[PDB]
């Protein structure tokens, strides 16, 4: 029984498939329909192939015959050069991401502050041409009617607002305000030495996680926020039939 | 002898050179190793700069939208001026709704005023007390703080979620009422 | 990038403007917040 | 649709000063570091320093420590190398560039290179 | 100490492998860059053995140990330039002496 262990060694150890005792399958994914196709070679057996097929991960897979190392070399070859085109493919993604919030912190607040502020000087400019309108025209002086409600609500709001306590409680909360600026600055200014403590008892980890259940928070607000939302667009239409 | 010396010789090299494959294998391995490993964490990172110029470009939309109605009632209030001075050169019962409008909003806006101010005396009252504390009083203590807020924070919103869904569900049967 | 988004966004919120109504919103925090939470 | 603009370069006399601007393009240069590399004619390349400043950091190379001085405006979004006190040894080719997507981890990088300016210090 | 790098020379086509040896052996940080000249550098291979967007195939860069190493397969018409290395110790970028190819002949 001697030469028959050293053939079946010699078979062991070699890519023609007596019994390679190097058999494993990998299954490499290949889309409809070209799953009828493929189709094993010279020294697969339908067993093994089959029994490859069975075991199916997922659809739209095939399997793949991995006799020895340097098939498993060769697979290594694939997921290196598969790796780089991922890689690739990310920083693409990255870079595109870059651009458009590039364009958006920059390019795009300032023109929608600046539209809105020019909005607000174009509203002040609107009304007052409005208003010398309802002036020259109607310099007929027979200006009544309507008029001695409208200068009832403003005299009634022009009263509110001139009022000297309703004036003076800024004042005093300005000052009221600037008392405990001092107050906090020097009390800062004394208290100014725990810093290390502070930078560092602040820096941590489960900042991280409250950083994650934030962001959680934030998505489950704004679900119910736009929820709700609908729950509103959605009645005021009832609220018509 | 020979061979059998010789084929035992062959035999053991060809072994040989297969485990000089299996080693050039098993090299090959920690750094590809590293680079799969790699991946997952940048496109789970890549994963969440997206989200964050979705959650700004969805946050400039409502700007854009604002924008777009304000220009628009601008528009129309600039309009019916000119149309005004247009049949003069060639509505004055119009502009007093424009006019008494300015009026019913500012109106409220001063409540708004009352409001913010009522709540910054409110607000200082109690700043005045921190520094008050903190004057009197003169890390690991607070990060409890953090935990007991935000462990409040999935009650309320959990409290919220049933109000909305109660809200909904008391719609849909207002909705169904209707075509049933 | 989100969370910074997050914060960005609330800090431009807390800043102003000529909005016609919309002024910036004073923050809290801790101690008076989680009451200010309760009494929701 | 990215590049690093270089300027502020040029001559200068022993001991003078000068302000370099690297204007980046294409991305935020809060999110991201900068960095500067300067090259003397016929050398190698010398980094010179960086600033990250989501981070707040700024880091000099030893050969001018305290002498120069990094940072880059936000609101601009543009990169600044402030150099004082300036030698014949600083007369060089300065480079200005960033890291890979973000830093991420610790893989030190330079991607995106501009096309640099030359500084002459010269009596 | 700014220097300027040592010019070795090849025929085209010839295999060329470049070494870097860092006197602080990294887990990752290292780049490797070609520069032609009059021209800016451009980034080649990033996290020792990464290679980058936008490079072709033949360079290859890896790790033995302490020594990071750049190698070119095969030397194209194009792939004559100065290569440099660099270190990365967080922070103190440090760039190698750099290392130019010339055509043999």
């Known amino acids: 029984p001697i030469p028959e262990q050293i053939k079946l060694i010699v078979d062991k150890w070699n890519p023609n498939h007596p019994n390679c005792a190097f058999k494993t399958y990998l299954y490499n994914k290949v889309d409809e329909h070209t799953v009828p196709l493929y189709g094993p070679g010279p020294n697969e057996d339908p067993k093994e192939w089959e029994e490859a097929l069975q075991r199916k991960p997922a659809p739209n897979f095939i399997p793949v015959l991995c006799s020895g190392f340097p098939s498993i070399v060769a697979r290594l070859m694939l997921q290196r050069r598969v790796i780089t085109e991922f890689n690739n493919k990310l920083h693409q993604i990255n870079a595109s991401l870059d651009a458009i919030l590039s364009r958006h912190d920059l390019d795009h607040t300032v023109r929608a502050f600046n539209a809105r502020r020019r909005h607000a000087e174009l509203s002040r400019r609107c009304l007052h041409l409005a208003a010398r309108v309802q002036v020259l025209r109607n310099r007929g002086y027979a200006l009544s009617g309507d008029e001695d409600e409208l200068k009832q609500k403003l005299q009634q709001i022009d009263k509110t607002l001139n009022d000297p306590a309703q004036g003076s409680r800024l004042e005093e909360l300005w000052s009221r305000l600037i008392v405990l600026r001092g107050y906090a600055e020097d009390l800062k200014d004394q208290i100014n030495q725990a810093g290390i403590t502070e930078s560092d008892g602040l820096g941590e980890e489960i900042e991280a996680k409250a950083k994650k259940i934030l962001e959680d928070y934030d998505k489950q607000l704004q679900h119910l926020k736009k929820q709700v939302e609908e729950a509103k667009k959605d009645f005021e239409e009832w609220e018509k039939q | 002898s020979e061979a059998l010396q010789q084929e035992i010789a062959k035999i053991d090299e060809e072994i040989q050179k297969c485990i000089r494959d299996k080693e050039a294998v098993d090299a090959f391995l920690p750094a590809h190793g590293e680079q799969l490993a790699a991946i997952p964490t940048d496109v789970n990172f890549v994963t969440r700069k997206s989200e964050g110029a979705h959650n700004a470009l969805s946050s400039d939309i409502l700007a854009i939208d604002q924008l777009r109605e304000l220009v628009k009632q601008d528009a129309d209030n600039a309009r019916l001026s000119f149309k005004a001075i247009d049949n003069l050169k060639l509505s004055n019962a119009d502009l007093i709704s424009y006019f008494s409008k300015t009026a019913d909003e500012m109106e409220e806006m001063m409540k708004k005023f009352e409001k913010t101010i009522t709540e910054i005396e409110a607000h200082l009252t109690g700043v005045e007390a921190h520094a008050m504390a903190m004057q009197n009083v003169a890390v690991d203590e607070r990060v409890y703080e953090l935990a007991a807020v935000l462990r409040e924070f999935e009650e309320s919103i959990l409290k919220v979620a049933g109000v909305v869904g109660g809200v909904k569900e008391g719609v849909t049967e207002l909705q169904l009422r209707d075509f049933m | 990038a989100l969370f910074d988004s997050l914060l960005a966004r609330n800090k431009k919120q807390a800043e102003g403007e000529t909005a016609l109504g919309e002024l910036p919103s004073l923050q809290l925090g801790l101690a008076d917040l989680r009451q200010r939470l309760r009494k929701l | 649709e990215v590049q690093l603009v270089e300027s502020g370069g040029g001559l200068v006399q022993p001991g003078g000063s000068l302000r370099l601007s690297c204007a980046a393009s294409g991305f935020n240069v809060y999110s991201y570091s900068i960095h500067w590399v300067r090259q003397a004619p016929g050398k190698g390349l010398e980094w010179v320093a960086s600033?990250?400043?989501?981070?707040?950091?700024?880091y000099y190379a030893d050969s001018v420590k305290g002498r120069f001085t990094i940072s880059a405006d936000t609101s601009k979004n543009t990169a600044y190398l402030q150099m004082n006190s300036l030698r014949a040894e600083d007369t060089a080719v300065y480079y200005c560039?960033?890291?890979?997507?973000?830093?991420?981890?610790?893989?030190?990088?330079?991607?995106?290179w501009g096309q640099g300016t030359l500084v002459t210090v010269s009596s | 100490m700014t220097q300027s790098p040592s010019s070795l020379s090849a025929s085209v086509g010839d295999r060329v492998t470049i070494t870097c040896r860092a006197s602080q052996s990294v887990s990752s940080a290292v780049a490797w860059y070609q520069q032609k000249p009059g021209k800016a550098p451009k980034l080649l291979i990033y996290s020792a053995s990464s290679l980058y967007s936008g490079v072709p195939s033949r360079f290859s860069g890896s790790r033995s140990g302490t020594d990071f190493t750049l190698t070119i397969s095969s030397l194209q018409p194009e792939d004559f330039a100065t290569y440099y290395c660099q270190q990365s110790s967080s922070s103190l970028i440090t760039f190698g002496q750099g290392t130019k190819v010339e055509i043999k002949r």
């Open positions: 600033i990250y400043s989501y981070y707040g950091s700024t």
């Open positions: 560039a960033r890291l890979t997507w973000r830093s991420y981890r610790g893989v030190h990088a330079l991607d995106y």
